[PDB]
């Protein structure tokens, strides 16, 4: 459980959707990050995959700020403390707005991916994730925008799964957090996008997994990387 709380580009901060805040506020701030109605710090899993919340998470609605980032530049995504437990991967994904992304319709959204970190060690199973590199940078998560994409106004959708208690069926935690990035630079790419309601399914091998037993693999979830 947890959320991202701030944002750093370009030497200042963004601040975040403060989901424990802002859903209390009714005249809450402008941001560049989405809304969501996840007042419970919590999680889209499998029952959901197939429904608008996996997008930019429950009930969640274009911010109405985008930052400016230089070319091939950084996004730190500062998120509050994540738990040990909640071991998984980290995964980026971009998706044009064709216009400002304040206005776009979250359901016709094509996203392709463009980092992955999933299992990084497993000698003491359940081993250390992505989500442990997370906690042991002091809970931030830093994305390098592309410079070999199109430069245009994009929706970065930032994710922790949480994997703790996948060996059920709809077990596995997603937890989306969704920005508006203004991409900049000289690229000319147009990658081949997934709809939101097509990155994941609830029988996925990363999804549907014990992890508590040695692992010899893991299969990051979601469509193929973008390079
Ligand atoms: C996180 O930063 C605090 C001090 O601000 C420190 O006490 C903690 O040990 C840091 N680093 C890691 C790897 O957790
Ligand atoms: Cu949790």
Redo the contacts with the bound molecule.
């Keep these: 459980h947890g959320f991202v709380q701030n944002i750093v580009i370009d030497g200042k901060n963004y601040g975040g959707y403060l989901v424990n805040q802002y859903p209390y506020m009714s005249n809450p701030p402008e941001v560049i990050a989405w809304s969501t109605t996840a007042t419970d710090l919590g999680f889209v899993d499998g029952t959901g995959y197939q429904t608008p919340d996996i997008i930019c998470h429950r009930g969640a609605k274009p911010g109405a700020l985008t930052a400016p980032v230089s070319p091939g530049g950084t996004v730190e995504l500062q998120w509050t403390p994540w738990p040990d437990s909640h071991h998984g991967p980290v995964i980026n994904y971009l998706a044009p707005c064709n216009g400002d992304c304040s206005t776009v319709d979250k359901t016709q959204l094509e996203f392709f991916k463009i980092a992955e970190s999933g299992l990084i060690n497993d000698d003491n199973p359940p081993g250390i994730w992505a989500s442990d590199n997370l906690?042991?940078?002091?809970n931030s998560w830093t994305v390098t925008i592309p410079t070999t994409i199109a430069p245009g106004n994009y929706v970065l959708r930032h994710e922790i799964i949480a994997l703790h208690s996948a060996q059920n069926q709809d077990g596995a935690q997603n937890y989306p957090q969704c920005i508006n990035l203004q991409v900049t630079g000289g690229g000319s790419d147009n990658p081949a996008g997934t709809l939101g309601t097509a990155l994941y399914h609830d029988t996925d091998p990363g999804i549907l997994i014990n992890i508590y037993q040695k692992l010899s693999s893991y299969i990051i979830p979601g469509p193929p990387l973008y390079t």
């Design positions: 906690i042991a940078a002091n």
